[PDB]
Amino acid sequence: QVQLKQSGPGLVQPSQSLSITCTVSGFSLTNYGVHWVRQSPGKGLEWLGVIWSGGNTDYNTPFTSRLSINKDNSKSQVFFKMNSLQSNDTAIYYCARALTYYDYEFAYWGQGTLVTVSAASTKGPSVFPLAPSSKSTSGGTAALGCLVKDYFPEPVTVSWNSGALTSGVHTFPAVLQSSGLYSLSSVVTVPSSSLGTQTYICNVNHKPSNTKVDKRVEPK
Amino acid sequence: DILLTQSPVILSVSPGERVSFSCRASQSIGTNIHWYQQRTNGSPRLLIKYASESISGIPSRFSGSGSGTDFTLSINSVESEDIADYYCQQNNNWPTTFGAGTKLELKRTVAAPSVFIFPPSDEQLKSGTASVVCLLNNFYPREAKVQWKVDNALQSGNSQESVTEQDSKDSTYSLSSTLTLSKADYEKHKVYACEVTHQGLSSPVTKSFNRG
């Protein structure tokens, strides 16, 4: 099918530059324009610019001087580069494609790239188990989880048993601690009688720091 | 640029009810308006193009109408998976602009939380920090109080809460409260208590444990 896959999230120092790569499949860059949209707390959805089939570009008025979009047709890659980032440039950046080659109704989106503009350093999380017990069991259902603590910047991805466990999973929104590092828990409820038979593993991936940890979570 | 104004900011409806989203433009834009759904942690999904035209793969319950400055996205019978934010986009005038969005919340019956408490791991204690987590699972409505107590001393300002977005399947919320201490303080005390108040409970529910 039609897909747009963007590069991983990351930290960009203030006044430095942002680079994202949008790799497409299921169509050709020679036939479609690729658009760039971002989504910020301050301004919500905001169209930035586009590179057309033939290599022409338009940039939204506020970005004409700090935005360049380039591409490699044979590699099916589109490259977004923005200069002199301030902290309010912290946003999710999307690449998108319209239904028709000249239009703007965005039917296909990339997964988005969360870009944090901050002076701080990348730091991977520590992963601690939230062990099931009697204090977390009622009516034959146990709760268990993983505490994903002290990482920067957002986001971190969490899954269970490599993707096979999705039901009853709650991964809480991260909260910023006084230290300026983030923290979250991910929990899941399972039948308590499966604790002796099934393994439970939270898979933690913090892309900005290239930290992947699998934490096995056991009754104590 | 065209300013798109979406009203209201929040809609709250019950399943099966019809619901309408409003988008107003700062000047006429004909029928050059598109609508999007954004789900929790998702990218925008195209619902309607040019005011009223349907999109492949979009359920029939979605429709749009309007022309000029006044537009409407409708869901004739809301489902729980419709829980999302909704955005309009105009493209009559360059550059294409988006509205600020409307949030769709779903009502349901009161559901009391299940409350679980988790002591800090031995692993975490080696690091010299202690996190005590209190979990409130699958409840409605969103309002809840969590009160921490250590050996009967009321805790204040040393916990943080996180609440999930509304569940797409059962319309409930879940909440975590995390009490943070040093290893040293944690070892100085015995009884760690999490007291929960919610409309679905006829009295406060307390989950606690004794260190060791």
Binding site: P41, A91, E154 | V9, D85
Partner: peptide, 10 residues
């Protein structure tokens, strides 16, 4: 107001 952690209006 849009929240980057959840990708939802808060």
């Amino acid at each position: 107001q849009f929240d980057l952690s959840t990708r939802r209006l808060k």
